[PDB]
Design an enzyme around this catalytic site. Sequence first.
Site, PDB file in Angstrom:
ATOM      1  N   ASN A   8      37.841  68.353  56.021  1.00  0.00           N
ATOM      2  CA  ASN A   8      37.049  69.237  56.863  1.00  0.00           C
ATOM      3  C   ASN A   8      37.153  70.678  56.399  1.00  0.00           C
ATOM      4  O   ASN A   8      36.181  71.431  56.488  1.00  0.00           O
ATOM      5  CB  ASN A   8      37.489  69.114  58.319  1.00  0.00           C
ATOM      6  CG  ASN A   8      37.429  67.695  58.825  1.00  0.00           C
ATOM      7  OD1 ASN A   8      36.856  66.821  58.183  1.00  0.00           O
ATOM      8  ND2 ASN A   8      38.034  67.455  59.979  1.00  0.00           N
ATOM      9  N   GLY A  62      28.500  54.981  65.986  1.00  0.00           N
ATOM     10  CA  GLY A  62      27.474  54.956  67.017  1.00  0.00           C
ATOM     11  C   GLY A  62      27.147  56.338  67.548  1.00  0.00           C
ATOM     12  O   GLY A  62      25.978  56.697  67.701  1.00  0.00           O
ATOM     13  N   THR A  63      28.178  57.132  67.835  1.00  0.00           N
ATOM     14  CA  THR A  63      27.957  58.498  68.297  1.00  0.00           C
ATOM     15  C   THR A  63      27.229  59.317  67.238  1.00  0.00           C
ATOM     16  O   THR A  63      26.197  59.938  67.509  1.00  0.00           O
ATOM     17  CB  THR A  63      29.290  59.155  68.655  1.00  0.00           C
ATOM     18  OG1 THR A  63      30.201  59.015  67.558  1.00  0.00           O
ATOM     19  CG2 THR A  63      29.894  58.500  69.880  1.00  0.00           C
ATOM     20  N   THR A  67      36.428  52.662  56.754  1.00  0.00           N
ATOM     21  CA  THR A  67      37.235  52.487  57.950  1.00  0.00           C
ATOM     22  C   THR A  67      36.581  51.613  59.008  1.00  0.00           C
ATOM     23  O   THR A  67      37.261  51.227  59.961  1.00  0.00           O
ATOM     24  CB  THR A  67      37.569  53.848  58.573  1.00  0.00           C
ATOM     25  OG1 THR A  67      38.501  53.662  59.645  1.00  0.00           O
ATOM     26  CG2 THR A  67      36.316  54.501  59.112  1.00  0.00           C
ATOM     27  N   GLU A 117      32.700  60.306  73.678  1.00  0.00           N
ATOM     28  CA  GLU A 117      34.125  60.114  73.889  1.00  0.00           C
ATOM     29  C   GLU A 117      34.772  61.420  74.324  1.00  0.00           C
ATOM     30  O   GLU A 117      34.471  62.479  73.763  1.00  0.00           O
ATOM     31  CB  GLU A 117      34.796  59.617  72.609  1.00  0.00           C
ATOM     32  CG  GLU A 117      36.008  58.748  72.839  1.00  0.00           C
ATOM     33  CD  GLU A 117      36.557  58.168  71.554  1.00  0.00           C
ATOM     34  OE1 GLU A 117      35.843  58.209  70.529  1.00  0.00           O
ATOM     35  OE2 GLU A 117      37.699  57.663  71.568  1.00  0.00           O
ATOM     36  N   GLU A 168      14.261  79.153  52.159  1.00  0.00           N
ATOM     37  CA  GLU A 168      14.121  79.028  50.715  1.00  0.00           C
ATOM     38  C   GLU A 168      14.845  77.813  50.153  1.00  0.00           C
ATOM     39  O   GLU A 168      14.484  77.349  49.064  1.00  0.00           O
ATOM     40  CB  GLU A 168      14.624  80.296  50.025  1.00  0.00           C
ATOM     41  CG  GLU A 168      14.250  81.567  50.754  1.00  0.00           C
ATOM     42  CD  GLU A 168      14.537  82.809  49.937  1.00  0.00           C
ATOM     43  OE1 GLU A 168      13.896  83.849  50.194  1.00  0.00           O
ATOM     44  OE2 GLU A 168      15.401  82.745  49.039  1.00  0.00           O
TER      45      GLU A 168
HETATM   46  N1  LIG Z   1      34.997  63.494  56.154  1.00  0.00           N
HETATM   47  C1  LIG Z   1      35.418  63.170  57.370  1.00  0.00           C
HETATM   48  N2  LIG Z   1      34.940  62.033  57.987  1.00  0.00           N
HETATM   49  C2  LIG Z   1      35.366  61.700  59.227  1.00  0.00           C
HETATM   50  C3  LIG Z   1      36.282  62.497  59.887  1.00  0.00           C
HETATM   51  N3  LIG Z   1      36.531  61.944  61.091  1.00  0.00           N
HETATM   52  C4  LIG Z   1      35.795  60.818  61.207  1.00  0.00           C
HETATM   53  N4  LIG Z   1      35.077  60.645  60.054  1.00  0.00           N
HETATM   54  C5  LIG Z   1      34.125  59.555  59.784  1.00  0.00           C
HETATM   55  O1  LIG Z   1      33.361  59.353  60.957  1.00  0.00           O
HETATM   56  C6  LIG Z   1      33.093  57.984  61.164  1.00  0.00           C
HETATM   57  C7  LIG Z   1      33.048  57.666  62.655  1.00  0.00           C
HETATM   58  O2  LIG Z   1      32.823  58.847  63.384  1.00  0.00           O
HETATM   59  P1  LIG Z   1      32.401  58.793  64.934  1.00  0.00           P
HETATM   60  O3  LIG Z   1      31.111  58.041  65.127  1.00  0.00           O
HETATM   61  O4  LIG Z   1      32.267  60.197  65.458  1.00  0.00           O
HETATM   62  O5  LIG Z   1      33.615  58.068  65.699  1.00  0.00           O
HETATM   63  P2  LIG Z   1      33.703  58.142  67.306  1.00  0.00           P
HETATM   64  O6  LIG Z   1      33.867  59.554  67.812  1.00  0.00           O
HETATM   65  O7  LIG Z   1      34.817  57.258  67.808  1.00  0.00           O
HETATM   66  O8  LIG Z   1      32.283  57.544  67.764  1.00  0.00           O
HETATM   67  P3  LIG Z   1      31.880  56.025  67.430  1.00  0.00           P
HETATM   68  O9  LIG Z   1      32.607  55.574  66.189  1.00  0.00           O
HETATM   69  O10 LIG Z   1      30.397  55.961  67.202  1.00  0.00           O
HETATM   70  O11 LIG Z   1      32.241  55.132  68.588  1.00  0.00           O
HETATM   71  C8  LIG Z   1      34.195  57.238  60.437  1.00  0.00           C
HETATM   72  O12 LIG Z   1      33.638  56.179  59.698  1.00  0.00           O
HETATM   73  C9  LIG Z   1      34.823  58.242  59.492  1.00  0.00           C
HETATM   74  O13 LIG Z   1      34.587  57.851  58.164  1.00  0.00           O
HETATM   75  C10 LIG Z   1      36.764  63.640  59.275  1.00  0.00           C
HETATM   76  O14 LIG Z   1      37.578  64.351  59.856  1.00  0.00           O
HETATM   77  N5  LIG Z   1      36.330  63.976  58.013  1.00  0.00           N
END
Ligand SMILES: Nc1nc2c(ncn2[C@@H]2O[C@H](COP(=O)(O)OP(=O)(O)OP(=O)(O)O)[C@@H](O)[C@H]2O)c(=O)[nH]1
Lengths: 100, 430, 430, 431
Positions: free
Chosen positions: B220, B136-137, B171, B63, B246
Site C-alpha cells: 500500500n 465481493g465488496t 488468497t 464490513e 490529459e
Molecule cells: N495490494 C493489496 N491487496 C489487498 C490488500 N488487502 C486486500 N487485498 C486484496 O483484496 C482482495 C479482497 O478484498 P475485499 O473485497 O475488500 O475483502 P473484504 O473487505 O473482506 O470484502 P469481500 O472479500 O468482498 O467480502 C484480496 O483478494 C486481496 O488480494 C492490500 O492491503 N494490498
Amino acid sequence: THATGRFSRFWDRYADTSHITSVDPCSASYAPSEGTYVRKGWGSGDASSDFLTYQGADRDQRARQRQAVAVRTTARSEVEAKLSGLDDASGLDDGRLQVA
Amino acid sequence: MREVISIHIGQAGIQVGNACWELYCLEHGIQPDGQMPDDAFNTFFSETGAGKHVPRCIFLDLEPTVVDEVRTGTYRQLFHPEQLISGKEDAANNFARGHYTIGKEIVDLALDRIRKLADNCTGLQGFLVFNAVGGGTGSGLGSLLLERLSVDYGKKSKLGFTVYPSPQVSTAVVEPYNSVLSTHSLLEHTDVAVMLDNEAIYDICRRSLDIERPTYTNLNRLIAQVISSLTASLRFDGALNVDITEFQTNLVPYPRIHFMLSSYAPIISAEKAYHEQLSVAEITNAAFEPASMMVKCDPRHGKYMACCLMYRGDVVPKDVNASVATIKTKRTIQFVDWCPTGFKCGINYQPPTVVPGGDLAKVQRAVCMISNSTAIGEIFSRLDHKFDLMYAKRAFVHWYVGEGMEEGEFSEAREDLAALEKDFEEVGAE
Amino acid sequence: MREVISIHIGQAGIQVGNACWELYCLEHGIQPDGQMPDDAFNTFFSETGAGKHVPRCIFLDLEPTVVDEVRTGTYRQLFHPEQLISGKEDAANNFARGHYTIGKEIVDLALDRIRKLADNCTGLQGFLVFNAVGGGTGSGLGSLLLERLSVDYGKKSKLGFTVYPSPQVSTAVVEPYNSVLSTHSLLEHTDVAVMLDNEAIYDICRRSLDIERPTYTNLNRLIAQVISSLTASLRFDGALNVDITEFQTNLVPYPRIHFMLSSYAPIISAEKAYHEQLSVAEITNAAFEPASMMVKCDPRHGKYMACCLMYRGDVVPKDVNASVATIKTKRTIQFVDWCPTGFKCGINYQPPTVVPGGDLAKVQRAVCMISNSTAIGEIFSRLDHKFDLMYAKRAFVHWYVGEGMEEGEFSEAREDLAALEKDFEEVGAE
Amino acid sequence: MREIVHIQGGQCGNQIGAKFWEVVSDEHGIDPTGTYHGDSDLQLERINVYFNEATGGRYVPRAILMDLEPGTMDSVRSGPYGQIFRPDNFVFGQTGAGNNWAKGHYTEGAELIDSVLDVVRKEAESCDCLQGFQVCHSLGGGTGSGMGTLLISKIREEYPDRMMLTFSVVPSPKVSDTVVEPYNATLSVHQLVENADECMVLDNEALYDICFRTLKLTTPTFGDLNHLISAVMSGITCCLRFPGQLNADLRKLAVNLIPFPRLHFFMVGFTPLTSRGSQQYRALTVPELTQQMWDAKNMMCAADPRHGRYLTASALFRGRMSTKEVDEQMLNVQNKNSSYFVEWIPNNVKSSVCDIPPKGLKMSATFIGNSTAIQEMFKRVSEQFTAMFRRKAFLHWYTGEGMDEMEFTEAESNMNDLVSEYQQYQDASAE
Ligand SMILES: Nc1nc2c(ncn2[C@@H]2O[C@H](COP(=O)(O)OP(=O)(O)OP(=O)(O)O)[C@@H](O)[C@H]2O)c(=O)[nH]1
Ligand SMILES: Nc1nc2c(ncn2[C@@H]2O[C@H](COP(=O)(O)OP(=O)(O)OP(=O)(O)O)[C@@H](O)[C@H]2O)c(=O)[nH]1
Ligand SMILES: Nc1nc2c(ncn2[C@@H]2O[C@H](COP(=O)(O)OP(=O)(O)O)[C@@H](O)[C@H]2O)c(=O)[nH]1
C-alpha cells in the site's frame, strides 16, 4: 461454592486442560500480552515498525551477520599483516650474525 | 480548483487509502488531528473556517472492521465520521452479494455522500476509485458505484486503480469468478483503469527493497507513492504540467483500450541509497524494466501503445528527452506502428516525500511510468481460462445465483472478456 | 544456508554421534543445556526465537537402551526429544529383522522427522549417515532408510561413514552376513561411503596415543574429529574452501567407486606433543602413513585414485604445496595412470578444538586425508570369503529367512560384491 | 456487530460448549463472574459477537444449552465458568434419550423443542445483525444427535439466509462407545446434508491420536479433547472478533470452501500443537505452522486427506505475519502436492490473516479442509449401518418411537448419494 452437589464430589472433572497454548515462557512460542495486542499503526512510523517486528528482525539479523563477518575479517587481516611482515628486513639471522 | 474525490472500496481499497492519506498528510504538512501549523491541499483536502483540513475521500465497505480500525486509529480526527461508511454484512467474496442484495443501500448512501463532497468543489478533475478486483465488496459494490457514477456524473474522469488477481499466487478461490464479473462491469464505466498485482509488487519489494517478508502495508505504501506521483502535477507546479484530462488524451488510443501497467522508480532502501547516481536516464530505464512492472505481465510479449512519464524532483526536460530518445532507440522496447510518438512526459519540481517508518529512501528524483500496451491481454487470458475451468463444472455457481444473478450473467461476462482479448489482439496486429 | 542433516543408526551410530555432537558443541561454544552465552552453527544446529540451539540430528535405533542413555546423560536438554527415535525390539544382529519386519514403522517415522528437519533448512548440503555395517539395526534399517532417502529426496549427497567388520577381530558371528547384505544395499544409494575399521582405529590409538586399552569412547572421539575436520569448511572460512558437493566432483571418478579411506593426523597425546615440530609436511607424511589409516587396508597393495586433504589451523598454501609436491615425488605413494593430479587440497583457518576428557592434545595444525584408492578391494575380498565359507553350510540362514528373506537375496548380494571386486580390479588395471 | 448464536446439544455438546466458552472468556479477559479484566481495548471492541452486556459490567454468553437430562447442565453450571451463562438459556427435559435418535428427535425432543426455539428466537432478536448460528453436538447419541438435527431443521426454516455452522462429533472408527452410534449417525448425517450450511466433522479417535502423537499426553481426559475442539471453534471466528490484515467471516469461508451445496463437510485442525518436551525445541515460523497444518495427523477428522483429494481448504492464520510469506507457503504446498488437489479449481486455498494471536502463542493457524477423504468415513458408517440394518438389530426402539422403517432407507440412500458425490469429484477430470 456455586457448584451443585453433583459434580462437586469430584472436581477432577474440571481439570486445568491448559495444555493448548501452554507454551512456556522459555519457549520460542511464548508471546506476552503486550506483544499480542498490536495495531498496524499507519500514523506513527514507530507503531508501524512495532507491527512489523519480523522485518526489523530480519534487518537486525543481516546487520549482526555482517558485523560478525567484518570482525572476523579484521582479525584475520591483522593475522596476514603479521605473517607478511616477515621478510629479509626482519632480523631472523641477526643472532647468527652476532654469534659468528 | 483542482479537486479530486477519492473513493476507497473494500478492504484493499481502504488499506491503500490509509497509506495514500498518510502520504498526502505528510506531503502537505497536515497533522493527523486535521489541521496544519499556497492552496496546494485543495486537490485532496478542504479547509474549514476553523483552519482544520478534512480530506475529500469516502471509505466504503460492507464490513465494519476495516472502517472501525480507521475510526480508532490516528486518523480519527482527520476524516469525516459520515465519510467513513460501514456496512453490516460482508459480501463474502461474492460479486452477486456485493452487487445485487447487500450493495444497494450502501451504494445509495455512498452516492449521497459523494454528491455532498462534489458540491463542495469548485472544479472537479475526477474520481480516484481504489478497489479490489477479486472480492465481493471491491468487485460488486465497486462496479455498482462506478455504474451509478457514470449514470449521474457522466463525463467526470474516473481513474480506477484496481488490484487484479495474481497469476499463480492468490488468497481467494472464487477470485476468477468475481474478477471476470467486475472486469465485464468496468470495461464500459471507468475512464482509465490501472492494473495492479500483489505478486508483482511482492517481487518488487523482495528484490528492490530487500524485504524478504513483504506485506500489505509495504504494498500500500508503494501504491500510495505511485498515486502521489500521478497526482503531483495537480498540486505542485512544474515544467510540463500534465492533467487528469490529459491522461486519457495522451494514453488511451481507443475507448475500449484503457487498462494500464504502472511502474515506480526508484525503489531503493536507505542502506542501498546514495550508492548509485540515480540519474534521469537510469531511473527511466528502471521504470521501463519489466521486473519493475507492478503487474505480472512481461511487456516484451506485447507492444507499447502509449507511455506517460511523471517525473518528480530535480528533473530537467533535456534529461527527460535524452532518456526517452535512448528508450526509443532501445531494441527491446517495441512500440506499435500506428503510434509514432507514444510518449507523454510531465515534470514536477516537488521531490517525493518519504513516510517515516517506511522502507523507501529519500530520493531527489522519481518516475511513475503508466503505459497502455497490448501485452496486458496476457492477464485477461489467464483469468479467462481460470474462469471457464471452474465454470465447466459450475463450481461455486449456486453461491452467485443465490443472491440474484443468472448463468446468463456469467456467460455475458466471459464473452465480453473474450471480446476484449480480441480487441487487444486486433490493436496489436498491424 | 549450509545445513547438513545428521543421521545416526544403531548402537555404533548413536555412540559416534554422542562424540560428534559433543565435539560440535565444544567447537561452537554451545553449552550442553542447548543455548550459548555468527551463524556458524547453522550447518549443525537450528536456533529458535528463544536463542536455544537444537541439532539437526536424528538418533534412529530399534533398541531403547542406547537412546535412553542419551535421554538420561548430560545432553538431555540439547537434543530434540522426538528426534530421538527408539525401537521396542532390537534387530538381534539380523539384517532381515531390521530391514523387513521391525524396520518398517521405525523408518516411516524416521522419514517423517527427516522431512520435518529438511523443511526447516533453506539449503541442504546433504546427509551424514553414521551406521554400523555388521548389525541388524545399522545394516538393515540403515539400508532401508538410505533407499527411502534416495527414492524421495533424490540427488541430495548422502555421505555414509560406515563401519565394516575388521579383518580378524570382530564381535559378532553373522557380521559377514549382514555386512554383505548392507554393502549390496549401499553400493547403489550412498554418494560417498567412508570406510572405517575398529581394528585400525585401535591400532592408531595404541601406537600413536599410547593407549594400551583403547575403547569405544576413544574410537568415537577419533571419528568425531575426522568428521569435524571434514565439515569444518562448511562452518568456518579459510583459503581453499571445500564443499560436500565438491567431494563428489573431486573424489569419485565413477559412481560405483565411491568408497574412501580416511586418515587423521596428528594423533598425539600432550606428553608427546610439543616434542616434535608438527609442521605441514610432517603431518601430511603422517596422514599418508598406512598405519594412520582408519581401515585395515594397506594402500601399498593398491593405487591411489584421488586424495582430498582438509587442513585445519595455521596452514599456508605454500606449505601445503611443498608437502604435496614431496608426496607426489615419493615413490611408495602410487597413483593411477589416468589421474595425473589426484589431489584436492583445502585449508581452513579454524584449528581443531580439543575435547576436555579426550586424549588428543591441542594441536595448531591438523590434516584429514580422505582417499579413493583401489586397495580398498582387499577388505571386500576378505568379507567375500568370510561370507561364502558360512554360506556353503547355510549357517544362520534360517534366522534371516524367518523374517521374510530369501536365498536369492544372499546370492544377489554375493554376486554384487563379486562385481564390485571385478570393478575395483578393472579400474586398478591399465 | 455480526453476532453468532451458540447452541450446545447433549452431554458431549454441552461439555464442548462449556470448554469453548471458557476459552473465549479467557481470550477476551472475562473472569468467571462475567466482569471484564482483560486490560486491552481490542478485547472489548468486538465482544458483542459472543456476549451481551448485563446490568453492570457482566457479560452473558449468547449460548443456548439443550439436554433431556438435567445432570449435564448441572455439571455445566457447576464448572469454573458455569456462572456466566444466563440460567434461562438452560433448557432441559426430565428423562434423557437412551442413545435413541428417535427418542431425541420425535418423542422427547418434540416437547422441549418449543422452548428451545423460544430461547433461540429471544437471543436472535436481541442481535443487531446475525451472522448465524453455531451448534456443537455429537453424532451417535440420542439427545445430542436427535434434538440437534431437529433444532437445525427448525432454525433453517426460521432463518434460511443466516449461516448455520455445526461441530458434529462423528462416532469414531475403531473404538465405539455406544452400540447405536451407526443408527444415530446415519439418521443425523441425512439431516445435516439438507439443513446445515457448514459442518465440521470431529472424531474422538482423531483427537486421541493427535494428543498422543503431537501433544504426547499420557492420561488425556475428555477435557483435553474438548479444549482442542474449543481452540478450533475460537480460531474459526477470530476474524470476526479481532482486526485482520486479510479478514474472512464465516460466510466468506463457506463460499470459498463449498463448491456444491451438498459437499459442505470439512476436516479441521489447529496449530501449533506442541508437546511440552519439544516446546523450546520448536521455532514458530509460518512455514512451520503450515507444515504442521497440512500433516494428516493434525487433522481432527479420522479420514486422512492422503486417500482423498482436497476440493478446497481455508487457513485462518493469527499473529504478526507476512502476507507474502503466508501466500507463498500456500502456493508451495499446492504445487508440491498438486496430486492431492482438485484440478478443475486453479486455486484451492482461501488464506486469511488476523492480527491478534491467541494469548500466549506468538502465532497460530486453524485449518478447514473440504476433501473427498470424508467419503471413507461415511462409507465406514454405512458399512456398520447396513450390517446392523440387514438383521434389524435394535430397530424396535426406533420403530416404537413412531418413525417408519423407510426413514432408515432414505437416510442411508442420502448418505450413499453424498459418498457418490465425493467420489465423483475425487475422480473428476478437467475438460
Ligand atoms: N495490494 C493489496 N491487496 C489487498 C490488500 N488487502 C486486500 N487485498 C486484496 O483484496 C482482495 C479482497 O478484498 P475485499 O473485497 O475488500 O475483502 P473484504 O473487505 O473482506 O470484502 P469481500 O472479500 O468482498 O467480502 C484480496 O483478494 C486481496 O488480494 C492490500 O492491503 N494490498
Ligand atoms: N567404531 C565403533 N563401532 C561400534 C561402536 N559400538 C558398536 N560398534 C559396532 O557396531 C556393531 C553393531 O552395532 P548395532 O547394529 O548398532 O548393535 P545394536 O544397537 O544392538 O543393533 P543390532 O545389533 O543390529 O540389533 C558391532 O559389530 C560393533 O563393531 C563404537 O562405539 N565405535
Ligand atoms: N469430545 C468429547 N466427546 C464426548 C464427551 N462426552 C461424551 N463424548 C462422546 O460423545 C458420544 C455421544 O454422547 P452424547 O451425544 O453426548 O450422549 P447424549 O448427550 O445422551 O446424547 C459418546 O460416544 C462419547 O464417546 C466430551 O466431553 N467430549
